[PDB]
Amino acid sequence: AFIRKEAEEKAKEIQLKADQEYEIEKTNIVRNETNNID
Amino acid sequence: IVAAVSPAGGDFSDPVTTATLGITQVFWGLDKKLAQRKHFPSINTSVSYSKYTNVLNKFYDSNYPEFPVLRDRMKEILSNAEELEQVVQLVGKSALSDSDKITLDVATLIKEDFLQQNGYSTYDAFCPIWKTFDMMRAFISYHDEAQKAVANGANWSKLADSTGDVKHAVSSSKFFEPSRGEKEVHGEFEKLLSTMQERFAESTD
């Protein structure tokens, strides 16, 4: 039970961090590409 | 124009070294330190420099490689690791932090797996542009991944515990093969970053 809950929590945190990393990388890559074009 | 100067005892005070360095836009120095140890080709990172490096960076940008960036990053890592060597030789290896230790380990990795290439070998005898560029890029990627992992609150040693695979893989990039299979190397680098992600997953927990 604790293994299942810990695994689910780890996977959930991994997913949240995944989406967050997606948005952050979006803004960062946007700024970088804009800087390159400029 | 490639001209060899043979000063007495390798001293730069010799007329040869000065007169040569004066009219030269580029100079590649030879050290007797790693040559006496029967180690590979010896060149001083604190001595050898080139004034043609700028236009060379402009020319290497034609292949969309990063000459200047990788060279400056590796040179900075080399200088910081040299200062770290002076400090470690001064006090000790227990007086440093995780980042400095990572810089020293990266210095050793760059010394064994990059600057040193066997000319008698059937692989390291000749290194292509794409091979060295991919090697420096993968090295920079592993360095950035390790630096980012150290900023996550993980120790350098603890990070180096599960990274043995990526280390042996980084040290195995010297052999490789002919022009075919560059994709296997770049892909191996991708597998290295992925391995870093797996390690991050392992840490939590």
Which positions ≥6 away from B92 have C-beta within 8 Å? none
| Phi, psi for B50 (deg, rounded to 5) | -140, 135
CA-closest candidate to residue B127, choices B171, B170, B176, B169: B176
Give B144's contacts in chain A (Cβ within 8 Å).
Answer: none
Distance, in Å, from the CA atom of B139 to the CA atom of B166, rounded to the nearest integer, reads 10
Exposure of B53 in the CB half-sphere (CA atoms within 13 A)? 14
Q: Which of B199, B204, B205 to mutate to test the interface with A (most CBs of A within 10 A)?
A: B204
Residues of A with CB under 8 A from a CB of B: 6, 10, 13-14
**Token pair 């390798």 is at which residue?**
B10
Structural resolution in Å: 6.2
CB B30 within 8 A of CB B42: yes
Q: Quick check: B64 contacting A, CB < 8 Å?
A: no
Touching A: B residues 92-131, CB under 8 Å = none
The DSSP code sequence of chain B is -------GGG-TTSHHHHHHHHH-SEE----STTTTTT-S----TTT-EETTHHHHHHHHTSS---HHHHHHHHHHHHHHHHHHHHHHHHT-TTSS-HHHHHHHHHHHHHIIIII---SSSSSTTS--HHHHHHHHHHHHHHHHHHHHHHTTT--HHHHTTS-HHHHHHHHTTTT--SSTTHHHHHHHHHHHHHHHHHHHHHHT-
Q: Does B205 touch chain A (CB under 8 A)?
A: yes
In degrees, to the nearest 5, what angle opens at C-alpha B127 toward C-alphas B12 and B100? 65
The answer to whether the peptide bond before residue B124 is cis (omega within 30 degrees of 0) is: no
- Separation of alpha carbons A32 and A8, rounded Å: 35
Which positions ≥6 away from B43 have C-beta within 8 Å? B28, B29, B30, B31, B115
Contact B201 A10 (CB under 8 A): yes
Q: Which residues in chain B are closer than 8 Å to A10, comparing Cβ atoms?
A: 201, 204-205
Q: Report the DSSP beta bridge partners of residue B26.
A: B50
Interface test with B, best of A12, A14, A36 (most B CBs within 10 A): A14
- Bridge partner residues of B49 (DSSP): B27
- Is some CB atom of chain A closer than 8 A to the CB atom of B8? no
**What single letter denotes the amino acid at residue A2?**
F
